[PDB]
RNA sequence: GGCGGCCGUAGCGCGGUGGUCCCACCUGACCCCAUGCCGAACUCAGAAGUGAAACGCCGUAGCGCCGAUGGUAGUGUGGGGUCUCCCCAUGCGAGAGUAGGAACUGCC
RNA sequence: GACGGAAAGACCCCGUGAACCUUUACUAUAGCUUGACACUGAACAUUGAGCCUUGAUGUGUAGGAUAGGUGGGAGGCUUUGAAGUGUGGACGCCAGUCUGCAUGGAGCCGGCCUUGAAAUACCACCCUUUAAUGUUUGAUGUUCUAACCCGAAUCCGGGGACAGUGUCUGGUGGGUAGUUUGACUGGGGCGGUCUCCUCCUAAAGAGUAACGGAGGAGCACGAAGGUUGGCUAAUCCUGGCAUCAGGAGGUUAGUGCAAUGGCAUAAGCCAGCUUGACUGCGAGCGUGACGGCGCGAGCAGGUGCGAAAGCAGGUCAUAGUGAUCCGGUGGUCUGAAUGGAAGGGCCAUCGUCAACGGAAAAGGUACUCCGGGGAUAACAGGCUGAUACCGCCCAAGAGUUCAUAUCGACGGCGGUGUUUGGCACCUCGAUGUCGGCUCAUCACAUCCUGGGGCUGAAGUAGGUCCCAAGGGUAUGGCUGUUC
RNA sequence: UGUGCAAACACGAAAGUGGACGUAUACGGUGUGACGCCUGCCCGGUGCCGGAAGGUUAAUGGGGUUGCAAAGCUCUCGAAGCCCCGGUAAACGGCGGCCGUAACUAUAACGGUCCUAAGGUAGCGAAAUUCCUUGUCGGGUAAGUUCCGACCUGCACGAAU
RNA sequence: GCGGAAGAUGUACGGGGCUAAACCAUGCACCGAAGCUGCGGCAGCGACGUUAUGCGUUGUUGGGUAGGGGAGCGUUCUGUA
RNA sequence: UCAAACCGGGAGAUAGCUGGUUCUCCCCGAAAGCUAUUUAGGUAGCGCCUCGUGAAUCAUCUCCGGGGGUAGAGCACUGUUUCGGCAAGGGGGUCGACUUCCAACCCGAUGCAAACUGCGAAUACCGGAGAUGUUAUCACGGGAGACACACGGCGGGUGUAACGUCCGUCGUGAAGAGGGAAACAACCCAGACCGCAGCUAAGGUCCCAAAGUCAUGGUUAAGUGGGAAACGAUGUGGGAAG
RNA sequence: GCGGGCCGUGGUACCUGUCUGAAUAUGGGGGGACCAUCCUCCAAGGCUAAAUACUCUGACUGACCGAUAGUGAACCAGUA
RNA sequence: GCGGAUUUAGCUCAGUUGGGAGAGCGCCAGACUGAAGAUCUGGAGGUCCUGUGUUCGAUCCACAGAAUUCGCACCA
RNA sequence: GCGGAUUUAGCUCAGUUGGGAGAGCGCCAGACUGAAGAUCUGGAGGUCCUGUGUUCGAUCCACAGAAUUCGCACCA
RNA sequence: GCGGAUUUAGCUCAGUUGGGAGAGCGCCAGACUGAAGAUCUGGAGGUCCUGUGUUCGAUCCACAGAAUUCGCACCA
């Protein structure tokens, strides 16, 4: 029933994430990335995380969420190639 | 397995469709009451009952 | 008070002061409308009484956050000795400390 | 001494080796009993079943219901072959009427045809059942009789359809035979572990072990699903631990589940409403190719809710699962030639393997052998030394008084490695085991005596310690035993 | 303990055969194994054998359902043996623990209390069959885990194991 | 630097032996490798030219168990010269 | 010859078991993981040797655009724990005041952590551009070895322990000459054609021994020249301070 | 139809054993499933030449071996 | 999974006439005994598996579901 | 040392839907009996091993410790 | 030597919330009985092994020593 034994977390397995989508080619509107479930917001090119910051471009296709709240969750302003 | 248990499997029946639904239905009354309205591969809105 | 600009140092607390121009409180619920039980919510109306909670200004930097001038421990990296261990070269420098910003700016 | 030569251990483990006997092992084969089929005919008695004929029709307690029955009632107008009646009999046990019987009062038919305890007329359905009889038939028991068996030369006698026996099925069945029954493992054994999820360990990606320390999943649920409105919690304080009112309160609450992460004018709570757990088809994701499965993200057509964007491919995310063969369930295809059936596939769901990537089911082995291996222990050596022995530092306290003059706790620091436990690189392609005995060779952390230190050394007598081999350590009873 | 014999028992694939040129004052299958004292407690849990309401027990045929036939589903009816109960321990066996009374102390002895029914009185017992046990008392000896006698709660000794 | 330090048939840094022929802090010249450089004779890989894996030139030049690849000669009998 | 005969016969039985396996020279020159297999001292697709084909431009030693959070540090979960001050509760002694003791909270100094943090590396690492390189990277397919590394030292983790299992650093056995270190797997320096010349490295340079009994300065005197410790010392030299 | 053997034999090979049991050419069987309708052919009786094998024996041949080679045997050998 | 049996007041069970729910034991009380025991008498105690259907009315019919038990099947 | 079981009112023991602490015997008393006995009725009798943790609340969960018992290990 | 248990008022023993030293028996007395007995009641009787340490205070903690008992260990 409850639990006891304080502790930090309860041990796993191997992380299973990566990070796809260069976001400097050709880039169709799907996850870019891999490492946690359920989130949207970003439509384009919109890394921006806490730290020397993040980036991304080139790629004109509307909407295009990230993972979650990780690489760049904010969610920042369009973006695409410069003359799609 | 079969007997006394909650969950319970039974096929629908559309009525003129080709059937194949799985759903299951515990014993918390309602009882004689299977589901509602159903697409089965065949025309649209038909009938349902996943009673048997 | 109206009307703009810049536009996360405007997070969050706290002080003084002013306009019966303005604004919430407040006041009254005849009606539109609405509350599972309560016009409290919701919605409508009038303005007796204040500023005790907005707004205009303006005074503290606590705390959060964003920048800047100074530097020990710690630490990156490659050679030296030495029983362990420690040293040197070189890029920085815990964290503490000294300061900057509580708006800024135009018009009626 | 050349770890001499030589005759490759029976101790021990290993090698999915061999054999033996033996269980509450598996699979079969003889044999025994019995039913039935072929070898078992006739007579008598019993029981079951099917069919035929004959007789009667087996069911129960009170006027609103009568009665196989039922819902409609009771003295209501028209039915087969003499009996109806009122006081008269029978073959299997109980009633209404039927026949050649015998007659009167009961009326001619009739009885019949409106009383509570005694009550109505016409063509399939629970009876349609039961009871009796004749024919066919199944099982059991008895008698008789031809087969068969034995004795005898024969006649014939004894036994007797029990059999003798052939075949098959089910049960029981050491009476007989095999370790086949995995691994890891501080040798092995005992004790603990082999699927899967989620910290630490894994030493900032990733990935990463051990009977590594902590803790769990094998399900549950229509709602703990979705949407909207309102609301926001723990906990503490005050007035009255249940409740209510006020204040403080990012939240430590709660959110199904082992934890982390996320969330409050909220994915939390309360209430209402409602139910996207839809169909079809693609692209992408799992360093490095590899399926099922899963997930994120579109398109085409359409279900729910919302104003709409939008949200769903079940429950915030990561454990709750499993092939082939076969069977049970949903459209089609398929066998000289046709009809009627039985059979043979594509996709998907459900049912079992939780010793859970998965066998239908347990055990001893000193008579041992062989092919190998240190990747397997019980000794000796080596490391460590916690244990063991001894010393040192500080020193409480005991000692009549007086730590320090024997003894000397607590605590701390060391040496030896004689003891023991014992981390398997050395030898098990093997330096056969303890102790003693006997025999040869090479040394010292000692009791008396001798020379010394301390003294709880006044003296004496003792305690403790150092030194020393120079000489001497020469003996018995019980036990195979070593101390 | 089995058997009157075309017997029991045993051998063989069969034909046949051993024991029978025998016959129960027989022979086959076993335990004990002399002699002497002997001989106490329990059947809750196997093998064999006998009886046995009810339950368990194929296929053909028969009945119902299904299908203008047929599959399939299902009912009904069932020997010997077995479930059933009982007997049997010269059947495999089981016999732990506690309190009180009472003693200078410990034990034995007796009853109960509990567990699993009884818990052991003949003898004799730590005995080649008891760990603990070089058990306790003692003989004997200068001393003897040896031996003998006794007590004896009998770890895992005990009745033709 | 020293006290805390007793044991095995003859004792000492390789020896002699050295106040440095020790040791410590530095430094210089030599002997000393099949090292490095120079004269006469190679292999593999790649580049240039080439039909060429034949030559010429150019960069790297040459240790090896297990193992991979390649060349070779001793040999018998039967062709054609 | 028997817990089971002899001879021959269908055996040149089957084994994931041992051993065996012989001419010269030249080039290059290992590894000890994953999925599945009646498979685990075996192969196939793959980490590694070699050869042929195919494609194509990087890669990484660098730099540049991301993800992790360990060491350490700080101070941190939890469960302990040091002192003082303040407030509240309970008990005891005398007065409804105070004193003493115990538990919880806050602050400062003190600090604590195998399951933390206001801060915070190195570092490894996903995607895209360069000096370098231009055909390397990378894509395909064939034929293999292969998924039994160990030991010593140091730091460990599990472990109440055995000539370990399992990680980390380093180093060797591997694939290393030559050479010194007296001898020596790893310490230092430095890398093999032939014959030959010169000059250096290892190390050595007084003699045997080939090379200076070489330069400047200093120490020790102990012959120390090498085991040595917890502990003691006006042996001696130097420096600061009352 | 029951119980088996065997075969590539599948409910569709062949044969053995027990039981049951036809019709008849205005008949019946077969064409790899069963039953009515086509085509083919007719069992339950029998006989039947020809086309390959081995190698004792005779002869020949062989880029076969050469007397620890080759058949065990070129010498008494299947003898000592 | 398949099939059979069973599923009545605490316990063990009878009850197919569809129209009475009952017995033994147990529990309580009474009588009796000095009393306690045992007889003996009396009382209480039943969603007669559950739902639905059939009938006027069903424990006692039909259908569906569940429990218990046995045989069988599965138990890579 | 290791693992398993056990550790409830005097004794012997039941008690996992976590929320009732109960049975037999014993002890005291009542009743009865002349009385004592035996029933029978009533009462008392329980840190339900200990601490802590978990929950709204635990004898009935988790952790740690102690005791009893058994197997194993050790024993010049 | 090593390991375990034990070491409370005369005897046999209980007593861990660390802060009460208690019971049975025995001894003395009372009550009762003619009296003695047995019940029943009362009282006395404790360096709770010894020292030291830990605490506000220990029989009930820690350490050392002593005694008893058992196991183990070892005899020219």
């Given at each position: 029933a409850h639990k006891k034994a304080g502790g930090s977390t309860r041990n796993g397995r191997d992380s299973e994430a990566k990070r796809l989508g260069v976001k400097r080619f050709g880039g169709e509107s799907?996850?870019?990335?891999?490492?946690?479930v359920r989130q949207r917001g970003?439509?384009?090119?919109?890394?921006?995380?806490?730290?020397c910051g993040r980036d991304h471009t080139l790629f004109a296709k509307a909407d295009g969420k990230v993972?979650?709240?990780?690489?760049?969750?904010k969610n920042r302003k369009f973006i695409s190639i410069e003359a799609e | 397995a079969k007997g006394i248990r909650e969950k319970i499997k039974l096929v629908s029946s559309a009525g003129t469709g080709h059937f194949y639904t799985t759903t299951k239905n515990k014993?918390?009354?309602?009882?004689?009451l299977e589901l509602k309205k159903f697409d089965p591969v065949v025309r649209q809105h038909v009938i349902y009952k996943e009673a048997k």
């Open positions: 799907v996850l870019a990335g891999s490492i946690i970003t439509k384009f090119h919109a890394g921006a995380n806490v730290g993972k979650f709240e990780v690489k760049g969750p | 014993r918390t009354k309602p009882e004689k």
